[PDB]
Design an enzyme around this catalytic site. Sequence first.
Site, PDB file in Angstrom:
ATOM      1  N   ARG A 189       0.984  -0.877   0.212  1.00  0.00           N
ATOM      2  CA  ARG A 189       0.356  -0.129   0.207  1.00  0.00           C
ATOM      3  C   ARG A 189       1.367   1.351   0.009  1.00  0.00           C
ATOM      4  NH1 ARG A 189      -4.861   1.657   3.525  1.00  0.00           N
ATOM      5  NH2 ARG A 189      -4.752   3.418   1.489  1.00  0.00           N
ATOM      6  N   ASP A 195      -3.543  -0.929   8.433  1.00  0.00           N
ATOM      7  CA  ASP A 195      -2.056   0.412   8.557  1.00  0.00           C
ATOM      8  C   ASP A 195      -2.117  -0.224  10.278  1.00  0.00           C
ATOM      9  OD1 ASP A 195      -3.752   1.886   6.690  1.00  0.00           O
ATOM     10  OD2 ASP A 195      -2.243   2.948   7.328  1.00  0.00           O
ATOM     11  N   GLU A 218      -3.478  14.552   5.205  1.00  0.00           N
ATOM     12  CA  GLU A 218      -3.042  13.902   3.952  1.00  0.00           C
ATOM     13  C   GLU A 218      -2.457  15.207   2.903  1.00  0.00           C
ATOM     14  OE1 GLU A 218      -5.192  10.210   3.807  1.00  0.00           O
ATOM     15  OE2 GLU A 218      -3.006   9.067   4.753  1.00  0.00           O
ATOM     16  N   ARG A 257      -6.650  16.025   2.064  1.00  0.00           N
ATOM     17  CA  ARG A 257      -8.553  15.135   2.420  1.00  0.00           C
ATOM     18  C   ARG A 257      -8.659  15.414   3.642  1.00  0.00           C
ATOM     19  NH1 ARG A 257      -7.253   8.995   4.176  1.00  0.00           N
ATOM     20  NH2 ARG A 257      -9.144   8.091   5.027  1.00  0.00           N
ATOM     21  N   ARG A 277     -13.988   4.396  -3.356  1.00  0.00           N
ATOM     22  CA  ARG A 277     -12.750   4.649  -3.250  1.00  0.00           C
ATOM     23  C   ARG A 277     -12.268   4.392  -4.813  1.00  0.00           C
ATOM     24  NH1 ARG A 277      -8.572   4.764   1.482  1.00  0.00           N
ATOM     25  NH2 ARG A 277      -9.014   6.715   2.486  1.00  0.00           N
ATOM     26  N   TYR A 324      -4.938   5.024  -3.001  1.00  0.00           N
ATOM     27  CA  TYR A 324      -4.470   6.296  -3.037  1.00  0.00           C
ATOM     28  C   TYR A 324      -2.769   6.154  -3.994  1.00  0.00           C
ATOM     29  CZ  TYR A 324      -4.027   6.713   2.690  1.00  0.00           C
ATOM     30  OH  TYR A 324      -4.115   7.478   3.640  1.00  0.00           O
TER      31      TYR A 324
HETATM   32  C1  LIG Z   1      -7.693   6.370   9.374  1.00  0.00           C
HETATM   33  C2  LIG Z   1      -7.267   7.680   9.340  1.00  0.00           C
HETATM   34  C3  LIG Z   1      -5.604   7.035  10.237  1.00  0.00           C
HETATM   35  C4  LIG Z   1      -5.045   8.748  10.174  1.00  0.00           C
HETATM   36  C5  LIG Z   1      -5.342   8.923  11.628  1.00  0.00           C
HETATM   37  O1  LIG Z   1      -4.750   6.508   9.406  1.00  0.00           O
HETATM   38  C6  LIG Z   1      -4.098   6.675   7.905  1.00  0.00           C
HETATM   39  C7  LIG Z   1      -5.863   6.427   7.162  1.00  0.00           C
HETATM   40  C8  LIG Z   1      -4.897   4.796   5.916  1.00  0.00           C
HETATM   41  C9  LIG Z   1      -6.026   5.178   4.611  1.00  0.00           C
HETATM   42  O2  LIG Z   1      -7.579   5.727   4.833  1.00  0.00           O
HETATM   43  O3  LIG Z   1      -6.296   4.521   4.381  1.00  0.00           O
HETATM   44  C10 LIG Z   1      -3.568   4.486   5.619  1.00  0.00           C
HETATM   45  C11 LIG Z   1      -2.574   5.936   6.459  1.00  0.00           C
HETATM   46  N1  LIG Z   1      -2.210   5.146   6.132  1.00  0.00           N
HETATM   47  C12 LIG Z   1      -3.271   6.024   7.799  1.00  0.00           C
HETATM   48  N2  LIG Z   1      -1.847   7.040   8.297  1.00  0.00           N
HETATM   49  C13 LIG Z   1      -1.702   6.165   9.873  1.00  0.00           C
HETATM   50  C14 LIG Z   1      -0.812   7.328  10.292  1.00  0.00           C
HETATM   51  O4  LIG Z   1      -2.011   4.987  10.506  1.00  0.00           O
END
Ligand SMILES: CCC(CC)O[C@@H]1C=C(C(=O)O)C[C@H](N)[C@H]1NC(C)=O
Length: 659
Positions: free
Chosen positions: A208, A233, A502, A518, A580, A613
Site C-alpha cells: 500500500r 495499517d 494528508e 484530504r 474509493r 492512494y
Molecule cells: C483513519 C485515518 C488514519 C490517520 C489518523 O489512518 C490513515 C488512513 C489511511 C487510509 O485511509 O487508507 C492510510 C494511512 N496510512 C493511515 N495513517 C496512519 C498513520 O495510520
Amino acid sequence: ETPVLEKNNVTLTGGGENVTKELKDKFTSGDFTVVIKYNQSSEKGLQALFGISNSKPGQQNSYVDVFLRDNGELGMEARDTSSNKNNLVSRPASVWGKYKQEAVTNTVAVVADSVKKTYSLYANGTKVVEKKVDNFLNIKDIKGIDYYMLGGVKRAGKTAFGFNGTLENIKFFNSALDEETVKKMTTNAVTGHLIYTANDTTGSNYFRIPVLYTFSNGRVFSSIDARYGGTHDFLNKINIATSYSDDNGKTWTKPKLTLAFDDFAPVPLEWPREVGGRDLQISGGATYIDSVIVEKKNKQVLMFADVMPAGVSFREATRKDSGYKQIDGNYYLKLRKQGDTDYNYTIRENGTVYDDRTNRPTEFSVDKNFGIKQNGNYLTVEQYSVSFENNKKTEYRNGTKVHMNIFYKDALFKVVPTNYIAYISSNDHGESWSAPTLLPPIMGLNRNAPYLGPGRGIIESSTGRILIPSYTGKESAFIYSDDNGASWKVKVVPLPSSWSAEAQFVELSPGVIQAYMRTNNGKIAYLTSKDAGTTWSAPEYLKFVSNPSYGTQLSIINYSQLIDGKKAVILSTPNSTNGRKHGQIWIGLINDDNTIDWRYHHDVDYSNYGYSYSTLTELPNHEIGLMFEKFDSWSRNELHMKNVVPYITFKIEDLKKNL
Ligand SMILES: CCC(CC)O[C@@H]1C=C(C(=O)O)C[C@H](N)[C@H]1NC(C)=O
C-alpha cells in the site's frame, strides 16, 4: 498438457457461441482449468466468459461459469439445482477494463481441483484467490450438463450473462493445472505494470501507499509500504521498500527493503479475506509507514517515514509525550528500563545511555540504527514469525537472534509508546542510504509527532525552504527547513474539523504555494500561502470532486512544460461518493492571478473500478508516471489483496480530455 479445446479470436456482442459439440463429455474426471485471454468491448453488467450448464427449464441453477463485473471483480460459480449446492468464489479488483481509451487485454483462469476441493482464480499472472469449499462441485457433480458455451451461460433455453468483447484465446483443459503453470499462462503485458509483487524480494504478499519521484539525474524512484499481515495499517508489520528505473520507467530494479525492523520476519503470509477473519491482525512489529521523498538543492535525497514501536497504533500512541527530554538545552530521546515505571534514562552524545537520576553514563549505548549495546557488545532478542495452522494464527519465536532494539517489545530499554518521524539521506540518488535520524520534538515535549502525508516534499524556489506535509488529526503540520535540512521547524495550522489531513504542495509562483489535502467532509481542501509557507489562508475546496466523508489521499505535482501556453499542475484522486473509485487525473492551468483553470480530466479505467492512494511524477521525457492502489483500500471487502498497485504511464495527449 494439451487443451481439450482451444479457440481464437471469437468476437461476441452478448449472444454467445455454442461449443457443445466440441466439449460434450470431454471432462472425464470432472475437474477443469479454463484459461481465457479476452478484452471487453463493454464493461456493463455481469458477463460470463464461458458457461457449462444444464440448459433445460427448471435446471437454471446447474452451471459453472467464470464472470466479470463492471468494478473489475473476477469470479466463478459452480452450482447444482437438485442438491441446492451453490458455490461462489471471487476477488474484487482482479482485472483491468480500459487504459488510454482502449480495452485492456487480460488473461484469466479458473482451476477446479477435486483432490483439494478448491476453486482457484488467476488474473494476469496472479493467483487472486483459492478457496476450499465443503460442498464441492466439479462438472461431473452437476446433473444433466448438456450445454457448453462461450460468452454466456445457457439457463432454461436463454443466454444469460452475455459477454461483450473478444475472446482472443480460450483453452479448456480437463484437469487441474498447477499454480506455476497457470501463473505463466496468464502472464501478459498487464503483469509488467506491477513493480512490487507478492513475495518478491521484499518477502511481502501485500503493499500500500506508493510514492514516485524523479531525481535530477533522470532516475525514476519509487517507495511503498510492504505490509506483511494483510493491508491493515495497524496492527501489522510494515517496511518501506524501494525500486527505481534508469530507463524512463520501462524497467525497474528488484525491490529492496530500505526501512525495516527485524523484530518480525518479512515473510509472505496468507491473510484471510472472509468476514470476521479479515479483521485479524498480528500483535504488532516495529513499523515504518507512509513515506515522503524529496531531493535537496545539493542533489542529496531525503526519505521520511512514520516510525512506530511494536504494538503501538495511531489509536494507542500517547498524545501527551514526545518521547524526548530536555537536558541543558538539548533534546534527548528518553528510555524506560524494564521494571521501572518512570523514564529514567536518555540517549546522549555518541549513543551513550545516561541515567538521568545520577546524571552519569551507564554501561549501555544505542547505535544509529537503534540497536542496544552493553559494554560494547550487542544485546539480542529472538525474532518472531507468524503462521496459519489452519484456522489459525500463531506467532512464535523463530530461532533467529537479532540485535535488541529500543523500538521492540522485548527490549531492556524502551522508547515512549508513541509515533515518531525518521529520515534517511542518500548521496547516490537512492542506491545507498544513511542510518535513520528521528526528527526532534518539533510539536513540543508534551506532544507526539505528526503523521506524514505520503508523497513528496517540495523546495520552494524563491527562498529555498524545504517543506514536508504532515498532520495531527486536528491540524495541518507543515514541517520545514530554512538551512538545507540541518534543522527542522513546523507551522501548525488548526483545521475546521478533525481531518486526516494528508497533504501535498504545489508552487503557483515564487513565494506562493498551496497545500491540497484530504478532509472529513467529502471535498478536497487547499490552503494558500503567499509568504513561502510562513502563513496560511483559510481552507477553500475544489468544486468538481465529491467523495465520502472518510476521504482519500491525493497526489498533486508541478509540471515543467506549458499546456495551452500556461503553467500546469497535475492532480490524481478518486472521485465518487460510493467508495474509493473513479480515479481521475486532472490538469489545472495556472492563471495570471494564481487561480487555477481545471480544464482537462482523464478517467483512469471505468468509473466503478477501484482507485485509492496515488502518486504522480513527471518523467524525464515529460510523460507522466502514475503508481496507484487499483482497489478500494478503505472497504472491508477489499482488504488483503495481492498485486493491486500498478505503475502506468501517460503522455499529456492522453490526459487532455473532457473539454
Ligand atoms: C483513519 C485515518 C488514519 C490517520 C489518523 O489512518 C490513515 C488512513 C489511511 C487510509 O485511509 O487508507 C492510510 C494511512 N496510512 C493511515 N495513517 C496512519 C498513520 O495510520
